[PDB]
Design a binder for this molecule. Structure first.
Ligand SMILES: Nc1ncnc2c1ncn2[C@@H]1O[C@H](COP(=O)(O)OP(=O)(O)OC[C@H]2O[C@@H]([n+]3cccc(C(=O)O)c3)[C@H](O)[C@@H]2O)[C@@H](O)[C@H]1O
Ligand SMILES: Nc1ncnc2c1ncn2[C@@H]1O[C@H](COP(=O)(O)OP(=O)(O)OC[C@H]2O[C@@H]([n+]3cccc(C(=O)O)c3)[C@H](O)[C@@H]2O)[C@@H](O)[C@H]1O
Ligand SMILES: Nc1ncnc2c1ncn2[C@@H]1O[C@H](COP(=O)(O)O)[C@@H](O)[C@H]1O
Ligand SMILES: Nc1ncnc2c1ncn2[C@@H]1O[C@H](COP(=O)(O)O)[C@@H](O)[C@H]1O
Ligand SMILES: [Cl-]
Ligand SMILES: [Cl-]
Ligand SMILES: [Cl-]
Ligand SMILES: [Cl-]
Ligand SMILES: [Cl-]
Ligand SMILES: [Cl-]
Ligand SMILES: [Cl-]
Ligand SMILES: [Cl-]
Ligand SMILES: [Cl-]
Ligand SMILES: [Cl-]
Ligand SMILES: [Mg+2]
Ligand SMILES: [Mg+2]
Lengths: 696, 696
């Protein structure tokens, strides 16, 4: 009848065994206080999901087991079934596993059967899928575990648990949406509870597909579904957004946070198993298509999941899943990201080159949002967060209440004007900093620039001129770039010495402000301020950035943003001749951010090369453009793209948000020395155009 | 690139080969006029899905083939791929099949692999599932087909079509929601179009699950999905509600009618196949879990599904599916049902015993609704419907415009008052008839009743008395029943002779007015007016009936319904003693229609016997009732149920609406001679109660 189960989101850290252990323990202790008899944790939670090439290392395996032993001998784990994740090597093959134990015995080790090998995922690099479906083998335990557990071997493979009162089965992360998912046969076999341990990272706007899936599955097959997921940054450019859930028969009973500053969040629910049994009768109490397939092996477990609590235990009522707006998503994720980055880097704060333009502004807003979250958290009684703030600012007695106050201690904004900067942009940056609370620095680079160009003249005997002073296209560009790069040099100097100049220990993380759209076209200066330490908006669309900044006005009460939004998007690096005004980035690029986004998505999402893309747009923009015209747009896109790709190889690491990122380290593997005339492809395009231009 | 496909709903009639053929032809001719190159029809459309035990008959097989030949030699079928359904016997085994042909050749015969064996479905009685998955065998054609088609054999089995431009696959009705559905592997294999031929009957409120499924499937796997379904009554108590659809990548492009008076409704859509290809790339352009399964056999077809039309052919835009309210569902289905029943029975009209109570009223409303639909249809240019009305009323020149006018010619209502009927009920019936237009008859049964009881006295020397005149419980009941049955005798007399008495040829179908709730408890008199020819509200809940009638007030403008709703639900068959008023049916039954519905659903839907049901309610009604109390309610329910079940065996056939029907012929097979003390079960219940009553 009535059972009480727990799932959870943990902020795990790659190879951080000590912390990882304490987090797992805490969740189990929490679940037990709430009356749970089964606890589900995230995929590979013992070592942290993102260990990458450390999985090749045997030490990883070893410590994981030492962590497992600690769990097994811990008095908290008594009388609750615990499903943890670690790597495990069986017969010289490395598997991504679930280790399920109860009262100092291992019940079953259950290896993953479908591995993620797309986008940021590459599990086949380190793990093998279990291929012997509906079968188990005897796994031989480490003497370390034997001595403790008093078992020689345990079942290893595709099996389910049978207890005195129920039948629980495992579905690991992506097995949930893999063709022919375990949950189908488990359902058929009569499995009433299905646990899914995830490690899925944030992706702007796609939170609902996870929820929908679990929902549909429970709706279609009946049953309780448990989903646990990592939450936070585990040591790289991903943010895991654990929307841990508990679903039954198509309804949701517990909704876990997508972004929060909690290291441990536990969901429970009290459900009557008979609701499953009667909901399944409601559908098909009959037989099926006559399948006669090999049935699931069964691990007998001497334990009752439901135990006497009924007399008081309130049944969980169904709930509606509340989603975040896309702007709320943006204001929360990169924000919580930046918080883990700061706290785990053990760095003294951030250094933000603030230009008075939209992106640098958005970046500033993310920090302010971070501060708010921290204040919220501290108010909420979050000891970990309080501990951390106190450690970051060095003040034992400190207690952030006003976000502007915390911000000041944590953020240093820096406006670096050139000879041609307007008074307006300088002002806007000054105002925005004033409003969020940051320590603002305003300086002029021109003395350093004059000096560099002096060195050049001194040695070549030649003086480059700006385009407006009769300079060549090359000279103009070079000059612009020098200023860009001097800014970067200065940014790092302050990162390294500004706190020093204020009488205080420590150094700052440099933050970048490239957006995903310009990153793709390479419309940036190699090694200017586009290269920093971390970039939180690197993966966000320009349009979304504007959207996010306009949303910040009212949510954070920052009026300084209006002028910033209204101002013309221009880079004041070159003097303006009489009769003309500044050129906008969109004219500079030779395409609007809108249409740039389309190329982006057609390229990475829809997997189109130039010919394919030419054909798509030809129809999409059939009214607006002519065949010759789209050819030119596409050609212009691919050439600029290819010419600039090398800029991508060295680009600052970015929070992952859009599934159309051009990021080269993990998500978008590509050449960087292309033939930039695309002779063959472009010829195909021409032929098509010529063919169409034969119509009357 | 761009293709144009058609699916359809047909009003097929069991064994009605001539008509069935003409309907299939018409749809194909319509699809071709709309530019379709593939046409999909419903499950077993050649013979009509509901042939039942006629499937055992070889003639069925034979004529189906003669119908197939007619299709093959027909000039309309040229240059369109046609997917029809018939039974087919291969190697002495009978399969439910799809026959796909193009230009006088059979491409592939594709047999069903999961058979429906639940509720009203019992396909295993006549058909065998195809068990050799991903395999085909040579089917040897009838000489009849050979001579015509010039082929010795064709592929028979699990295969897909490959054309010059696309890949089309088959999913038959329930295979869509069977574990491990064809659409998963077909998707994996690269099948871009999937056709599903259905024969699913109406079920109140469950229309969305069909739509959701197709939607989710296309969303999850990408692709175009086509669904065709029978629409109307094919010769029995089911109404097929063809919500034929066309879906792609998660959106709907065409929505077919659930209830209409069309014999043929064709949906088309013009879709670009490249949208599929680019939507699938969007998800997983990679590889999967490494499955290495036997792949689908491929029938090469020398045909291009897309042919030059692009230059003009508008792409279909996505649409939102519009559902009917439950009351709209009720006002339309049974209505369209009654229309096919009337027209195919070749009967002159209906005869409705109208009591001045809610159910008889609802029944009247269904007829009025029918008339409206017919008027609507005729206005809409529907020749078939016009032809039929003209044939039913015998007037060549007739053209229904006013629904009250048609109603008058088609409906005869009959109020049969006893000695104890009130003037109020008589009035209400008179008024409702006036308002809908029916020929109303009002009479008094008492002369016939006196006469029967005279015969009894004359021969036994004894005079039974009503309870209020000192009569025994048995006498009272008997007397009541006699009146009930005399009403039935009279109803059939008018059915058979009322038109005659009005100078006009023909006879009437007697309509019944039992609701699903009282049918279950047996709260009716065996062979009273509860037994008629057909009952359209036999499967509808009392609460829904009240809901439907209140909705009719404003939709049909019938004020007479208000008093009918407001009036006390009492059966005026026995005289009332001084000091007391009439007893309501709900007190008579010893439970409210509400709680009766719960028993109904817990019983048939949730598959609970008395013990199970006692346990469910014990929790459901934990605040409201005590354990001893629910025991009594349940016990009272099962006993009355069991005592009365025999009434079910002979009960009038009813439109199917609720999936908790107690109908004995098809949907709810049960004993009818029970041990009505349920000694064992009831003892278990007592033990549980006694156990609980030991708590303080
Ligand atoms: N295939 C290849 N593989 C490896 N390296 C390759 C290469 N092709 C060129 N390179 C080299 O890469 C280097 C590129 O760097 P660099 O020479 O500095 O020049 P680069 O970064 O290519 O040009 C900077 C761009 O930034 C734009 N800009 C201007 C002003 C302000 C802003 C702003 O928004 O902040 C942007 C400006 O319009 C210009 O197109 C060159 O030395 C070039 O020789
Ligand atoms: N196990 C079994 N298998 C086969 N047959 C069985 C049987 N048990 C009894 N039977 C027989 O079935 C027959 C039942 O018919 P019958 O004797 O007429 O009587 P019956 O139909 O059982 O009683 C009629 C019921 O209708 C109710 N009623 C009264 C007034 C108006 C209305 C209304 O709403 O219209 C309803 C009334 O309260 C009463 O409970 C009996 O002859 C009985 O011997
Ligand atoms: N005036 C400025 N003050 C501080 N940072 C700037 C300034 N101008 C540009 N940046 C940085 O350079 C990048 C944008 O280049 P640009 O478009 O030329 O302004 C971003 O990473 C900015 O943070
Ligand atoms: N006064 C009446 N006039 C016509 N039909 C009636 C009348 N009373 C009952 N019926 C029929 O008998 C059934 C209901 O029985 P009762 O509840 O006793 O009215 C329904 O099938 C009615 O159509
Ligand atoms: Cl060892
Ligand atoms: Cl077993
Ligand atoms: Cl230091
Ligand atoms: Cl800007
Ligand atoms: Cl902008
Ligand atoms: Cl033959
Ligand atoms: Cl093949
Ligand atoms: Cl006649
Ligand atoms: Cl009533
Ligand atoms: Cl009523
Ligand atoms: Mg900007
Ligand atoms: Mg009524």
């Amino acid at each position: 009848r009535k059972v009480t189960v727990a799932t959870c989101a943990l902020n795990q850290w790659a190879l951080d065994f000590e912390g990882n252990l304490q987090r797992i323990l805490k969740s189990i202790e929490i679940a037990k206080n709430r009356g749970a008899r089964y606890r589900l944790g995230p995929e590979l939670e013992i070592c942290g999901y993102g260990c990458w090439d450390h999985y090749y290392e045997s030490d990883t395996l070893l410590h994981s087991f030492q962590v497992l032993a600690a769990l097994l001998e811990s008095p908290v784990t008594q009388d609750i079934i615990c499903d943890v994740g670690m790597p495990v090597m069986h017969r010289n093959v490395r598997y991504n596993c679930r280790v399920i134990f109860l009262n100092r015995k291992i019940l079953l080790i259950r290896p993953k059967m479908a591995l993620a090998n797309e986008g940021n995922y590459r599990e086949l690099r380190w793990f093998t899928p279990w291929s012997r479906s509906r079968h188990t083998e005897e796994y031989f335990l480490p003497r370390m575990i034997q001595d403790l557990t008093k078992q020689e071997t345990v079942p290893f493979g595709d099996a389910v648990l049978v207890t005195w009162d129920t039948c629980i089965g495992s579905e690991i992360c992506e097995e949930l949406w893999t063709p022919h998912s375990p949950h189908i046969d488990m359902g058929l076999d009569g499995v009433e509870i299905i646990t899914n341990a995830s490690g899925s990272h944030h992706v702007l706007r796609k939170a609902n597909t996870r929820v929908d899936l679990v929902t549909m599955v429970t709706s279609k097959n009946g049953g309780i579904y448990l989903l646990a997921n990592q939450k936070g940054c585990d040591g790289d450019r991903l943010y895991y957004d654990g929307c841990a859930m508990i679903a039954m028969n198509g309804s949701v009973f517990a909704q876990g946070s997508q972004f929060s500053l909690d290291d441990v969040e536990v969901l429970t629910a009290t459900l009557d198993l008979e609701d499953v049994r009667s909901y399944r009768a409601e559908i098909s109490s009959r037989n099926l298509a006559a399948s006669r397939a090999s049935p699931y092996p069964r691990v007998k477990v001497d334990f009752a999941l439901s135990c006497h609590e009924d007399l008081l235990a309130p049944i969980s009522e169904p709930i509606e899943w509340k989603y975040h707006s896309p702007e709320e998503e943006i204001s929360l994720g990169p924000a919580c990201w930046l918080w883990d980055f700061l706290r785990r880097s053990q760095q003294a704060g951030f250094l933000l080159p603030l230009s008075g333009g939209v992106d640098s502004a958005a970046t500033a807003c993310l920090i302010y949002s971070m501060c708010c979250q921290v204040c919220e958290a501290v108010r909420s009684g979050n000891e970990e967060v309080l501990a951390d703030v106190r450690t970051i600012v060095n003040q034992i007695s400190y207690t952030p209440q006003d976000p502007r106050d915390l911000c000041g201690r944590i953020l240093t904004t820096c406006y670096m004007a050139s000879k041609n900067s307007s008074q307006e942009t300088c002002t806007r940056a000054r105002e925005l900093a004033q409003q969020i609370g940051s320590h603002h620095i305003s300086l002029n680079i021109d003395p350093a620039v004059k000096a560099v160009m002096g060195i050049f003249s001194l040695v070549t005997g030649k003086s480059p001129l700006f385009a407006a002073h009769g300079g060549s296209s090359r000279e103009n560009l070079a000059l612009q770039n020098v200023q860009a790069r001097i800014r970067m040099v200065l940014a790092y100097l302050f990162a390294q010495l500004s706190l020093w100049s204020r009488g205080v220990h420590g150094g700052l993380l440099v933050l970048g402000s490239a957006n995903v759209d310009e990153s793709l076209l390479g419309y940036l200066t190699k090694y200017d301020c586009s290269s920093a330490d971390i970039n939180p908006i690197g993966g966000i669309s320009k349009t979304d950035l504007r959207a996010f900044v306009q949303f910040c006005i009212q949510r954070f009460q920052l009026p300084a943003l209006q002028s910033i939004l209204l101002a013309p998007a221009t880079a004041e690096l070159e003097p303006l001749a009489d009769g003309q005004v500044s050129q906008t980035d969109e004219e500079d690029m030779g395409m609007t951010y809108a249409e740039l986004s389309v190329y982006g998505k057609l390229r990475k999402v829809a997997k189109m090369g130039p010919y394919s893309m030419f054909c798509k747009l030809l129809g999409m923009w059939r009214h607006i453009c002519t065949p010759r015209q789209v050819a030119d747009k596409v050609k212009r896109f691919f050439s600029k793209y290819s010419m600039n790709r090398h800029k991508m190889t060295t680009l600052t690491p970015a929070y992952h948000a859009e599934n159309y990122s051009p990021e080269d380290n993990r998500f978008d593997l590509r050449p960087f020395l292309y033939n930039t005339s695309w002779p063959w492809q472009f010829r195909c395009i021409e032929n098509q155009v010529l063919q169409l231009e034969r119509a009357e």
